[PDB]
Amino acid sequence: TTLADVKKRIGLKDEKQDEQLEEIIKSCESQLLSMLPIEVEQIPERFSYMIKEVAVKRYNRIGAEGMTSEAVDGRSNAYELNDFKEYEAIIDNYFN
């Protein structure tokens, strides 16, 4: 995806986090392209939104990439077990 399309959803309006979001998006693209069959060279645009959605999930998770729960001075988060879990049922169902 563009960075701007992720940037819009999470409501950001400045440059101060671009270097993280760039690496997050680049990681999501690498992972999704790892899940497709070996012959697939590119994520088909049919799935491009996944790269955005997980990029937002990871943006929220930042500073908690391994953690199931996170409490910091009364702020408490609990995290979904697997970012791509919903999409495995789409990817597999599409190629098979």
Binding site: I10, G11, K16, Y59, G63, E70, V72, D73, R75
Partner: protein, 100 residues
């Protein structure tokens, strides 16, 4: 943590009182804005000797830590005095109260 909000740190640097001019003009150092995470805004009734004011007691969170001295923060257009700062390994957490 989602670190969405932007905080401006400040140091209000305390000057020595000048008895020849009856002034002790402080000076503000002010820093570039940092990505942070902050509690929802409260506007509690606080009841001072002269009357009611809209106070805000709050907590603000930033990833890793900052090299430089600070004393106040400006965020959401409210200026706060830092009243505690709590230094975890990979994170810093500041207890902040509105001035006024």
């Amino acid at each position: 943590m989602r670190y969405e909000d932007r905080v401006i740190f400040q140091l209000e640097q305390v000057a020595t009182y000048n008895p020849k001019t009856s002034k002790k003009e402080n000076t503000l150092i002010t820093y570039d804005a940092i990505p942070c995470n902050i509690n929802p805004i409260s506007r509690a009734r606080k009841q001072l000797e002269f009357g009611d004011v809209k106070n805000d007691v709050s907590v603000l969170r930033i990833k890793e830590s900052i090299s430089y001295p600070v004393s106040h923060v400006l965020v959401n257009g409210i200026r706060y005095k830092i009243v505690d700062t709590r230094i975890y390994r990979h994170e810093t957490s500041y207890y902040i109260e509105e001035v006024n």
